[PDB]
Amino acid sequence: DRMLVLVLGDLHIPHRCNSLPAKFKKLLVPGKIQHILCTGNLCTKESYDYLKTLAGDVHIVRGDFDENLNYPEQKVVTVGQFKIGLIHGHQVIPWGDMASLALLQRQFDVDILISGHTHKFEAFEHENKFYINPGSATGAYNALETNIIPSFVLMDIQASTVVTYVYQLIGDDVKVERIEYKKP
């Protein structure tokens, strides 16, 4: 038995982008995925409504451009044997700072910490804990990057192991990378 968890964010619809890539939408079939963890910056209810069609359980934290000011700034969600922390990440300066993310890991008391904002995918183990940034699922521009690849993450959780899949749109084709993490 497994849990599938979709991890995505920084869509920036409607200001920076118009929609998810068509090839991504074709992959996200309703009913398949159990949980959605969204780093924020949807930035409107239209994208929230779309996420609700995909899974029964949708968790979203507040980004710096979200129009829904009621989203929580951070969240901790338990899926199977894993506690997962979620924050958008504009609060961390310098952006993506490893020492700050590791402090948040300890303070949230989580096995996996998910953050966004940078629009650059990351998935790595650091001091026996796992860190994910799904990137921007629409490939939305930012101020500090010259190339943003549309990206999202799927976690496949099985007992004390998670297999993290990253999906990227490169050219017009979907390509993937796979990273395994086991709790210590």
Partner: peptide, 16 residues
């Protein structure tokens, strides 16, 4: 080269 991965959402070439 021709490396591909199975995933729960389908089978795809490797990014790198």
């Amino acid at each position: 080269x021709t490396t591909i991965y199975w995933t729960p959402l389908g089978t795809f070439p490797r990014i790198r």
